[PDB]
Design an enzyme around this catalytic site. Structure first.
Site, PDB file in Angstrom:
ATOM      1  N   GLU A 116       0.788  -1.236   0.000  1.00  0.00           N
ATOM      2  CA  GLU A 116       0.000   0.000   0.000  1.00  0.00           C
ATOM      3  C   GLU A 116       0.819   1.285   0.000  1.00  0.00           C
ATOM      4  O   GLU A 116       0.590   2.173  -0.827  1.00  0.00           O
ATOM      5  CB  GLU A 116      -0.944   0.053   1.207  1.00  0.00           C
ATOM      6  CG  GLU A 116      -1.750   1.339   1.246  1.00  0.00           C
ATOM      7  CD  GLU A 116      -2.634   1.437   2.471  1.00  0.00           C
ATOM      8  OE1 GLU A 116      -2.614   0.483   3.272  1.00  0.00           O
ATOM      9  OE2 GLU A 116      -3.329   2.463   2.632  1.00  0.00           O
ATOM     10  N   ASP A 150      -0.450  -5.085   3.315  1.00  0.00           N
ATOM     11  CA  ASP A 150      -1.037  -3.917   3.961  1.00  0.00           C
ATOM     12  C   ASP A 150      -0.424  -3.811   5.353  1.00  0.00           C
ATOM     13  O   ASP A 150      -0.782  -4.586   6.239  1.00  0.00           O
ATOM     14  CB  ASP A 150      -2.566  -4.053   4.027  1.00  0.00           C
ATOM     15  CG  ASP A 150      -3.262  -2.756   4.383  1.00  0.00           C
ATOM     16  OD1 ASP A 150      -2.627  -1.843   4.965  1.00  0.00           O
ATOM     17  OD2 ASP A 150      -4.474  -2.667   4.094  1.00  0.00           O
ATOM     18  N   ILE A 209      -0.586  -1.642   7.824  1.00  0.00           N
ATOM     19  CA  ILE A 209      -1.629  -1.422   8.818  1.00  0.00           C
ATOM     20  C   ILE A 209      -2.951  -1.327   8.080  1.00  0.00           C
ATOM     21  O   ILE A 209      -3.230  -0.312   7.457  1.00  0.00           O
ATOM     22  CB  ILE A 209      -1.411  -0.137   9.647  1.00  0.00           C
ATOM     23  CG1 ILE A 209      -0.065  -0.192  10.387  1.00  0.00           C
ATOM     24  CG2 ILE A 209      -2.564   0.056  10.637  1.00  0.00           C
ATOM     25  CD1 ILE A 209       0.250   1.090  11.183  1.00  0.00           C
ATOM     26  N   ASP A 210      -3.751  -2.387   8.138  1.00  0.00           N
ATOM     27  CA  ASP A 210      -5.114  -2.280   7.650  1.00  0.00           C
ATOM     28  C   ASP A 210      -5.972  -1.812   8.817  1.00  0.00           C
ATOM     29  O   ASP A 210      -6.053  -2.471   9.839  1.00  0.00           O
ATOM     30  CB  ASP A 210      -5.612  -3.601   7.093  1.00  0.00           C
ATOM     31  CG  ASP A 210      -6.956  -3.460   6.433  1.00  0.00           C
ATOM     32  OD1 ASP A 210      -7.161  -2.448   5.737  1.00  0.00           O
ATOM     33  OD2 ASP A 210      -7.819  -4.330   6.647  1.00  0.00           O
ATOM     34  N   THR A 258      -5.892   1.978   9.505  1.00  0.00           N
ATOM     35  CA  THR A 258      -5.151   3.167   9.954  1.00  0.00           C
ATOM     36  C   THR A 258      -6.024   4.167  10.704  1.00  0.00           C
ATOM     37  O   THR A 258      -5.604   4.726  11.706  1.00  0.00           O
ATOM     38  CB  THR A 258      -4.461   3.884   8.763  1.00  0.00           C
ATOM     39  OG1 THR A 258      -3.626   2.940   8.092  1.00  0.00           O
ATOM     40  CG2 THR A 258      -3.590   5.052   9.263  1.00  0.00           C
ATOM     41  N   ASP A 287      -5.818  -5.142   0.752  1.00  0.00           N
ATOM     42  CA  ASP A 287      -6.823  -5.275   1.811  1.00  0.00           C
ATOM     43  C   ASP A 287      -7.290  -6.699   1.948  1.00  0.00           C
ATOM     44  O   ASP A 287      -7.677  -7.135   3.038  1.00  0.00           O
ATOM     45  CB  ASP A 287      -8.055  -4.415   1.537  1.00  0.00           C
ATOM     46  CG  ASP A 287      -7.770  -2.935   1.667  1.00  0.00           C
ATOM     47  OD1 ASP A 287      -7.060  -2.544   2.615  1.00  0.00           O
ATOM     48  OD2 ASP A 287      -8.269  -2.171   0.823  1.00  0.00           O
TER      49      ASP A 287
HETATM   50 MN   LIG Z   1      -3.125   0.176   5.301  1.00  0.00          MN
HETATM   51 MN   LIG Z   2      -6.250  -1.398   4.067  1.00  0.00          MN
HETATM   52 MN   LIG Z   3      -4.406   3.590   3.940  1.00  0.00          MN
END
Ligand SMILES: [Mn+2]
Ligand SMILES: [Mn+2]
Ligand SMILES: [Mn+2]
Ligand SMILES: [Mn+2]
Ligand SMILES: [Mn+2]
Ligand SMILES: [Mn+2]
Lengths: 274, 275
Positions: free
Chosen positions: B68, B88, B90-91, B93, B218
């Protein structure tokens, strides 16, 4: 003070949570109340009767308002008498689906004012408590609401409600749209009013609002929010009213009033009326 | 499997990243903006991604990456047949910034454009979700199984509102929610992360997830966790799932998934493999 009652309420909430935790792992016989989405199980009913019987034994002169007892025909009239306001399982839909946010909620009112509240989020094992003037806690951690006064940087929680009337659903979603497009950072729903409000008390969300809840949804968690430094009010902007079916629980009056400004009110039967 | 070593390593990196995230969430943060005032990023997102990519690079220098924050830095999100780590960092945020307690590190691993394993670490919860194709899905050692529910009127859905605040788009998102809600379904939930939403479907705690507007990173990790738990992935058209299409239905079964597809109006979006 009322410390002895409160300590007792915490132990009762924990025993009820154990019952719920054991049941959530077993087969569900799902029953309906007022609609095809208004659910109840034997566990809701069994926990409520356990709680009320236990409280009655220790405090015979006290009064009760419980969700399923009201379903059984009891009144939701709040007098000055010490009164236990109980939601035996807040998040029954979560419960029957094993969605891991399920709460036992107990609010204790004297002179129609909440003196303490207990909300046990059973599956995650989080015990939320607050006594008036004594602070709010989750599992030994003292809670503090967030400092955020800018609505465009806020994270809100809410629920879509139990109604499926198209007019009502349109209003609920329209209110969500108005808040969303201010904009706010986001909106979340974990499926329980009590736990949503406890998340505001922790500062993990900035505010909660909902129309259509009942006194037992909010009696436990309201004082947890305020003892964390938060505020309660009506979505009308008026004073919070346990029986009005409406609530904003927020970190502060600035976010609370900004939210009220956006919310179109839905007509609702009060808990204290026929 | 020769990929089993990669997966083992991935689980190790995810936990490590998770510890970094769990520490930072307690601390003050510099919150920056990406595409809009509601599209957020912190130094932790970027640091975790850098750590993950460099670690993987040192151990498998011929592998490709889709991350990402790397894409935000200009790198291409095009999926080739080459072994590719889809990350990802940090999914969740926005959750992270607020200390809303659902934050995930997600790593998906594709060979020939097909996901071979997925790792989703829900940091705050301490829940490590994993799945290798053919080997089943697990949460902290316990085998997962989706729910049995085939009656849409008895189902619990998860979804998110998305990052757009364009009125027309928001109206469509909410219109889709309205149609599903009024079928009726039992309810709709949103914990604020696609990966964790999908992992909840894997567990059977929710019956189905849908969203338009997500990215490959994601869903790369959690997709195979759902399917190895016995579920299905599908495009919102009812067609085959397309990792780069920005759309997904992840359900316990095809009956619920197709029923959901039926109600959804498609929102136009730039694909991850488009400029
Ligand atoms: Mn993220
Ligand atoms: Mn995400
Ligand atoms: Mn983001
Ligand atoms: Mn109920
Ligand atoms: Mn209840
Ligand atoms: Mn309730």
């Amino acid at each position: 003070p009322w410390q002895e009652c409160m300590d007792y309420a915490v132990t009762l909430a924990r025993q009820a949570g154990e019952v719920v935790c054991e049941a959530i792992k077993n087969e569900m016989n799902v029953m309906l109340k007022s609609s095809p989405v208004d659910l109840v199980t034997a566990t809701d009913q069994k926990v409520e009767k356990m709680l009320i019987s236990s409280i009655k034994e220790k405090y015979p002169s006290h009064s009760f308002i419980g969700e399923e007892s009201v379903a059984a025909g009891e009144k939701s009239i709040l007098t000055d008498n010490p009164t236990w306001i109980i939601d035996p399982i807040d998040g029954t839909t979560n419960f029957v689906h094993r969605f891991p946010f399920v709460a036992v909620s107990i609010g204790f009112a004297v002179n129609k004012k909440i003196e303490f509240g207990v909300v046990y989020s059973c599956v995650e094992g989080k015990m939320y408590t607050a006594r008036k003037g004594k602070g709010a806690f989750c599992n030994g951690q003292k809670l503090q609401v967030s400092q955020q006064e800018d609505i465009t940087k806020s994270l809100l929680v809410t629920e879509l409600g139990s109604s499926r009337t198209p007019e009502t659903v349109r209003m609920v979603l329209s209110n969500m749209e108005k808040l969303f497009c201010i904009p706010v950072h986001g909106i979340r729903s974990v499926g329980t009013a009590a736990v949503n409000m406890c998340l505001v008390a922790t500062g993990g969300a900035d505010a909660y609002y909902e129309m259509g809840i009942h006194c037992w949804d909010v009696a436990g968690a309201g004082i947890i929010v305020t003892e964390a430094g938060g505020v309660l009010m009506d979505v009308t902007g008026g004073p919070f009213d346990l029986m009005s079916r409406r609530v904003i629980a927020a970190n502060n009056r600035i976010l609370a009033e900004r939210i009220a400004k956006e919310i179109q009110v839905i007509p609702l039967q009060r808990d204290d009326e026929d």
